[model samples]
Target chain A: AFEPAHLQGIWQLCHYVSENPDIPGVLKPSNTFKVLSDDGRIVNFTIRPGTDAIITGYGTYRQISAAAYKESIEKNIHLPMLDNKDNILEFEMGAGGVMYLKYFIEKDLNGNELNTWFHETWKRVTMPPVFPEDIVR
Target chain B: AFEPAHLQGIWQLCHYVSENPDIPGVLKPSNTFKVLSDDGRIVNFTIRPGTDAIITGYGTYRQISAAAYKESIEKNIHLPMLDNKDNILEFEMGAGGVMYLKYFIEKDLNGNELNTWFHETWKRVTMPPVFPEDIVR
Candidate 1:
């Protein structure tokens, strides 16, 4: 029962725990974003590493079922070698307000089939947190 | 470069945490086993509350890819209302030899649309822990 309207406002990635540690440029937690919109199209960007000049490419998403959505992004700066077809992000905001964005790609640009994927947890904040706090050491 | 033979052995379910709270039956870690066979089949059971007996269900599986797998179990004793062609365990041993068993069904007879799913973790144990050891409380 995930409504298109469910993906509005801010979402924070608690931590990007890599299933495979060997993969490079994996994401970490405390990464927040201001989701300007998510109906039909997804327009969101980093607000924590806000000044990294690292803009996550945005793309359109389609609701495949009550609990699944098929989404594609423009550019995935989170990756090391820059796989343009950067993993597709599937949205599943089920139990908690946490959005489980499952990366949807067989392999990265380095040709290593991603042994790990992010069961990244997204937290909804009332107002955005301080921009770019030195990531939790 | 992935070999299916790597999946041979007994896997232990470590924990099942949900990002959302309203969700019930959150498996707080476990005392379970998933024995993968070379003949494309798997047998598993939970030793939690293991007393007089530990009943297990058996099933067949298919390797959809190097990292992804599709599985179904017969006679599920854990989920009383389960046997509905319900059990779907997807595998991804992303790191540290831990198996990320993503339970693949969305909604159940509960009609809740399951706004929930478990990123259940299973580890390969050289020797399975003593039967139902408080599950680390």
Candidate 2:
């Protein structure tokens, strides 16, 4: 029953980090989070082409209404995030993308913050050699 | 040996139809040429992700020299123009989506020049949408 109006606009973050905690750290900060209307779809976020940070991933915000979020959790769409003991909040935007935002909301067994650090690792796609306008009319 | 000098510059060209009897149709006109440096270090034409046409199949040139002509035969690397044949060029740029350019460089058996056409069809890349700057940088 969730609609686009329910998930439009910018979301202020508390923190952004990865699931890994060894070797070179994967921690980057993001300033903006915009959710657009996806009509109705579920998008997935995963690691880049060549990287070993299976514990961490980054990408844009897909539109997942509150209803879709509930169904996803029921169907175990993103099994890893659900299986992880630390993961808390999972937001789903219709076919757009799924984001594991909050991991370990409160303190852990040892009274540690349990907040893992993360970074935004994304690859940019470039433009073609000739522009449409460059073509003869 | 195929040194870097084997490539260089921006080669380009323009095609037109001919009215000859035997070859009676369109003529593939072309020009502009260039060469690369002796070493394979200098990139005359930088291969940016989105800007460069990702060549598939055969006779595809991924990179070109800066000193090369904008309208030369080499420019026809992935794009080939012939008499009475229809060829298609397709590309997927992150932001612009998927685009296709089509051109018929030949005349029908009757002697009528074929018309050229192009179109674009695409959907944005998956989450963490890949940007052009990601790779170039």
Candidate 3:
């Protein structure tokens, strides 16, 4: 019903952190979240592939408007405490049509302020590298 | 084992297309890519949750160094031609720590040009709303 063109593609994790004073940055370095707008299925996982550690969350999502989304967490890999929980993330696309959360849902599904805060950002990855070293190890 | 911080978090779709002009614009507005770094599992899906169309790819990823990641495709929901294929993506955190793709692997597992080009960026969702209207429909 809106600008579907403005909200589609592959988005890779840029950065993120936990605002909780007790644990300022607890998120892993290889975390990633992928959104499937065609089916509204949001798949979130943290894996450094072949690194021996993995956790994932499977859920659904809905576009509340042109710049917002309701992300529902229905299942997870190791941590299942948040199964079926939900959040409202403000969505926005910046230069190059790259997507931005704009901001995270401060409270939980309970309307209660969560002690911990989660912040993340991502950028679009392009192919046909400008230089071979760009994709090399 | 290098800096894993370069690739972590929820990534929403922005913009992407096939590298080959003859096969351009193959992806839809609902396409999405999510990466979870902890366990190294990669979750790629293209669906809007409530929508009828749903396609998914299950795989794993890892940071070979500070600014490079290896992403592989092991399974898919409906499409199966790319099973067990993989590529590497060069990563870099730009100003504001918003991650960007330094580049993408020039070739696929088959050593082909991988005439498909995928590019996307995502921003973190934070707070009581950057604007009151941000949380509106």
Candidate 4:
């Protein structure tokens, strides 16, 4: 069971490998990182390894129900088609601090029909000491 | 005629509509913004109005030549297809504090071949007083 409070924090996409028997799910940093702030702000971004360059989008999010939430996107530099859009997502909280989120997108940036469900997997993570200070206005 | 120093500052995308005779190019706030810092840092973001949510990417950039520069994108959450990519852009400084930037993106996020030139229009603008303080680490 998951509550809306559980969503407040920084999360990163990761690959879980079963190869290491000592550790059941060794977290690997993928390209995406998302933050759901206590003030209902949502910031999603990706950091390049060495360059520190990032592409990001920010907006507001609200929990619609126990199983769903809505992200009112203001703009997305990475996924520009999502700019000024609303994404209603159904989510599942999995073991090992993993969250599975799915939503419906009608089209791709190229205006190609997707009409499909978009899925994202995220793992809870700790923010760098100065990370919050950098983003908070 | 553009100098490297001319690029240092805050810039935002805008529409130059000539409909209004009173104003040749009334600056409008588009979704994209780029900051080229004096210290060689680049932060690009889109701020959603009202919500104060933002999507951003940060990385380092360098001048390869007088007419061109390379953005060593660490990550772009908005345009994830550009993650870990180097964007070499040839630019032109235009009148009314406008800049024309063009680049090449080989593929879209879905692995579809774009193989085309991408164009972006920007205008220099003053940043909000607290804006820099928010992004600077």
> Which is the leading candidate under TM-score?
4
The digit string of per-residue lDDT tens for model 3 on B39-80 reads 566764432221111235657787787767877777654334
Tens digit per residue, CA lDDT, model 2, A23-43: 554423232222221232222
Candidate 3 has a TM-score of 0.39
Model 2, stretches more than 4 Å misplaced?
A1-39, A50-78, A81-100, A103-137, B1-137
List DockQ, one per candidate, in order: 0.02, 0.03, 0.03, 0.02
Tell me each candidate's TM-score.
0.37, 0.22, 0.39, 0.42
lDDT per model vs. reference:
0.56, 0.27, 0.48, 0.66
Better of 2 and 4 by TM-score: 4
Model 4 stretches with alpha carbons more than 4 Å out: A1-137, B1-5, B16-27, B127-137
Model 3 bad stretches (over 4 Å) = A16-31, A35-37, A49-55, A76-82, A102-112, A115-118, A129-137, B1-137
Q: Please state the error at residue A133 of candidate 1 in Å.
A: 56
Q: Candidate 1 on B1-137: residue-level lDDT in tens?
A: 56663677778776433333223223333567888877778777766331433757667766666766766666666654455363555676666677776665566556567644445667886745565543433
Residue A78's lDDT in candidate 4: 57
* lDDT tens per residue, model 4, B70-90: 888887765667778888979
Better structure of 1 and 3 per DockQ: 3
Model 3, span A1-137: residue lDDT tens = 76543444455455434767676663222334354434466655432321211225567777777667776877654324456777666766666435667534445546687655444555444332122221211
RMSD of 3: 17.5
lDDT of 4 by residue, A1-137 (tens): 54554886557665555677797875454645576765677776553322222436768898988989889998776557788999987989998678889999999988999898877778775312222233321
Measured with C-alpha atoms, the lDDT of residue B45 in candidate 2 is 18
